[PDB]
């Protein structure tokens, strides 16, 4: 019963990693405006500019929150497993 | 019972990784406006510009949230497994 | 019962890692404005500019929050496991 | 008497790359990519048996 | 009497890379990329048996 | 009598990289990237048997 794992690669050249895992709320490049350029305007009343009310990554009610997770968030993962019972 | 894993690649040249995993709420390049350029406007009343109300990645009610996940979020994954019972 | 793990790679070239794991609330490049440039405006009344009310990463009510997680957040993970019962 | 006996390699000239040279009243400029090049490598070899034999005489005369 | 007996390598000239040279009333400039190059490597070898044999005579005369 | 008997290596000239040279009334400038280069390596070798044999005569005369 002989198991042999041999790994000798030759990686020639630089390696670049960027934004390997992006999640959640992340909008970008958004513009909300009213009367950006206005002249000879008599009255401006009851203006309501709203982007959001409440930010809650977890919002639970009477919840049995029971996750069992084994995750690997990375850029370069090397998950090697040998088993010889 | 002999199992041999040999891996010696020659990777010639640079490697580039970008935005390997993107999820969730991420809209971009959005414009909401009213009267961008206006003149000789007497009254502007009851303006309502709304983008969103509530941001909640998890919103549960009387929920039995029980996931069992084994995930691998990455850019380059090397998942090698040898088994010799 | 002989199990041998041999790993002698030759990584030639620099390695760069940036933003390996980004999550949560992180919007960027957002502009909310009213009357950016205005002239000869008599009255400006009842202006309401709101971005958000409450920031709460965890907001629970009568919740049995019981997660069992074994996660690995990194840029370069080397998870090697040998088992020989 | 401009003379070039031997000119080689990367030598570009008289190049103009421009974006919005003379512009006015521009609202947004997002994600502009103005890159001339990435990597400069004269001898880039991989597992190469580089065995050149040369006997060159660079003799350009001017009178 | 401009004379070049042997010119090699990376030598670009007369290059102008510009973005919004003469601009007015600009609101946003986001994520501009103006990079001339990344890496400068004259001899970049990997497992290379570099064995050049050269007997060159660079003799450019001016009278 | 400008004479170059042997010129090599990285020698660029007359390069102008500019962003918003003459600008007015600009609100935001975010994440600008103006990098000429990263690494300067003349001899960058990996496991290389570097064995050059050269007998060169650089003899450029001026009278």
Residue numbers in the entry:
A (entry chain C), B (entry chain A), C (entry chain E): 6 to 90
D (entry chain B), E (entry chain D), F (entry chain F): 21 to 83
Article sentences:
β2-microglobulin (β2m) and its truncated variant ΔΝ6 are co-deposited in amyloid fibrils in the joints, causing the disorder dialysis-related amyloidosis (DRA). We show that the aggregation of each variant in vitro results in fibrils that are polymorphic, which contain different numbers of protofilaments and different numbers of β2m subunits per layer of the amyloid fibril structure. High resolution structures, however, show that this polymorphism arises from the assembly of a common building block that is strikingly homogeneous and monomorphic.
Amyloid formation of the variant β2m sequence, β2m-D76N, which bears a single Asp to Asn substitution in a solvent exposed loop of the native monomer was next investigated. Subsequent 3D classifications revealed that a mixture of 1PF and 2PF forms were present, which allowed us to refine the structures of three distinct fibril polymorphs: two different 1PF filaments and a single 2PF form. The cryoEM density for D76N-2PFa, however, was of sufficient quality to allow an unambiguous atomic model to be built, although the amount of resolved protein sequence per layer is lower than for the equivalent structures of fibrils of β2m-ΔN6 (i.e. ΔN6-2PFa). Strikingly, protofilament #1 has a similar structure to protofilament #1 in ΔΝ6-2PFa with residues 6 to 90 resolved. The length of ordered polypeptide chain resolved in protofilament #2 is shorter, with only residues 21–83 being sufficiently ordered to build a model. Despite this difference, the same hammer shaped motif is apparent. The ΔN6-2PFa and D76N-2PFa structures have a very similar structure. In each, protofilament #1 adopts a “termini up” conformation, whilst protofilament #2 adopts a “termini down” orientation. Notably, this marked difference in dynamics of the termini of β2m-D76N fibrils occurs despite the absence of any obvious perturbation of the amyloid core structure caused by the substitution of Asp76 for Asn, since residue 76 is located within a polar cavity that accommodates either side chain without generating steric hindrances or electrostatic repulsion. Interestingly, the ∆Go analysis suggests that E74 and D76 are still destabilising in this conformation, although this does not include potential stabilisation by water molecules that are not resolved in the structure. This analysis does however predict that the D76N substitution would completely negate the destabilising effect of this residue in the amyloid fold, which may explain why D76N fibrils form faster than the other variants.
